[PDB]
Each structure stands twice: as structure tokens, then as C-alpha cells.
């Protein structure tokens, strides 16, 4: 359970993201795909992209980055009271998209890196720890839904 002070640190940096949701989503997906190429393989939509320049030039990738970060922002702004938002996401990622929990760890690392690059003055260690806790809570709660459905592994 995050404290109120931890949530404030999380949402204070997240308010900085929402000024350029699409730029952040591009940086985060690109980092994810470069760092963990098995992730790119889960998107039939993106698997033709073979270079970082092609990734940066894809408008469809930029659109998906906004989809991802819009859903994550709505979950973070619930400060843990996020059951209604996670249900459908856990269900589609477990049963349709077939995304292992481990890849949610990977995208959490990319999010943290990109926030540190773009917002260092609002993403010192206290805020990095709080955002780590928030993303761990996200993963923990998705993992319990996966386990229900037979996908925790
Ligand atoms: C912060 C974590 C993530 C969030 C908030 C998120 C959110 C979403 C949303 C809102 C959609 C569209 C609606 C739906 O299908 O449920 C989507 C689709 C999808 N996601 Fe995620 N996602 C996350 C992580 C991942 C990761 C790590 C992968 C793969 C490695 C992934 C793979 C996919 C795929 C394959 C689709 C369908 C894309 C398409 O072909 O249109 N997601 N995601």
C-alpha cells in the first residue's frame, strides 16, 4: 500500500507526462523494444520495425504509446483503487495478447527510465521509489488476475 505522500510524488511527475503523452509513449515503447526484443514480437502491428529510426517514424506506434499511457494514467490517478480499470486490461493481456507478467516488469523499467530522462527535477530518488512502488502494485494486481485465469506461469 503506497502512502499518501508516495502517491503525491507519483502523480506530481505524472502531471508532467500529460503535457506530452505521445512523446513519452514513443520513448517508452522504443526503449522497451530495444531493451527486450521479445516484446516487439508480441505486436503483429509493429514487428516490421527493424531500426530505431523506423520506430520513431511510425505514427501507428506513437498512437499506441498514447493508448498505453492513457490507460496507465487513469490507473495511477485511482491511487490503488483501480480494480475496475485493471480487470479488463488483465483479461485482454493474459488471454488475447498473451503478455507475460515479466514483460510488464520490462515496460515498468522503461517508464521509469523515460521519466528520469524527461523530468529529473521531479523524479529524484524519493519519486523514483514511489513510482517503483506504484508500478509494482500495478503488476501485483494484474498478476493476481492472471493467476485466477490460469496465466501466472
Ligand atoms: C503499462 C502497461 C500496459 C498498459 C497500460 C497497456 C495498455 C493497453 C491498452 C489500453 C490496449 C488496448 C486495449 C486492450 O487490448 O486491452 C493495449 C493493447 C495491446 N497491448 Fe498493452 N499495455 C501495457 C503493456 C503491454 C506490454 C508490455 C505488451 C507487450 C510486450 C503489450 C501488448 C499489447 C498488445 C499486443 C496489444 C494489442 C495491440 C494491437 O495489435 O492493437 N502491452 N495495451
Domains and CATH numbers, the chain: 1-153 (1.10.490.10)
Ligand 1 binding residues, C-beta < 6 A: 39, 42-43, 45, 67-68, 71-72, 89, 92-93, 97, 99, 103-104, 107
| Best residue for ligand 1 mutational test, from 27, 48, 62, 71 (most atoms within 8 Å of Cβ) | 71
Please list, in sequence order, all residues whose beta carbon lies within 8 angstroms of the beta carbon of residue 90, skipping any fewer than 6 positions away.
141, 142, 145, 146, 149
Helix 125-149 × helix 83-91 angle, to 10°: 60
Helix (H, G, I), strand (E, B) or coil at 112: helix
- Which residue bears the cell 520490462? 106
Q: Which of 68, 73, 98, 109 to mutate to test the pocket of ligand 1 (most atoms within 8 A of CB)?
A: 68
Q: Per the structure block, which three cell numbers stand in for 45?
A: 502491428
C-alpha angle 67/68/70, rounded to 5°? 65
d(CA 137, CA 80): 7
Q: What resolution, expressed in A, was reported for this entry? A: 1.2
Q: How far is the C-alpha of 110 from the C-alpha of 46, rounded, in Å?
A: 18
Of all helices (H) and strands (E), which one includes residue 86?
A: helix 83-91
Residues of each annotated binding site for nitrite: 64
Q: Which residues are annotated as a binding site?
A: 64, 93
Amino acid at each position: 500500500v503506497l502512502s499518501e505522500g508516495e502517491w503525491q510524488l507519483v502523480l506530481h511527475v505524472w502531471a508532467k507526462v500529460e503535457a506530452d503523452v505521445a512523446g513519452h509513449g514513443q520513448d517508452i515503447l522504443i526503449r522497451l523494444f530495444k531493451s527486450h526484443p521479445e516484446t516487439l514480437e508480441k505486436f503483429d502491428r509493429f514487428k516490421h520495425l527493424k531500426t530505431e529510426a523506423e520506430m520513431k517514424a511510425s505514427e501507428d506506434l506513437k498512437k499506441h504509446g498514447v493508448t498505453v499511457l492513457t490507460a496507465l494514467g487513469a490507473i495511477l490517478k485511482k491511487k490503488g483503487h483501480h480494480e475496475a480499470e485493471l480487470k479488463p486490461l488483465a483479461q485482454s493481456h493474459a488471454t488475447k495478447h498473451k503478455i507475460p507478467i515479466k514483460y510488464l516488469e520490462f515496460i515498468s523499467e522503461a517508464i521509469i527510465h523515460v521519466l528520469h530522462s524527461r523530468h529529473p527535477g521531479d523524479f529524484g530518488a524519493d519519486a523514483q521509489g514511489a513510482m517503483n512502488k506504484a508500478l509494482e502494485l500495478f503488476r501485483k494486481d494484474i498478476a493476481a488476475k492472471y493467476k485466477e485465469l490460469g496465466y501466472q506461469g
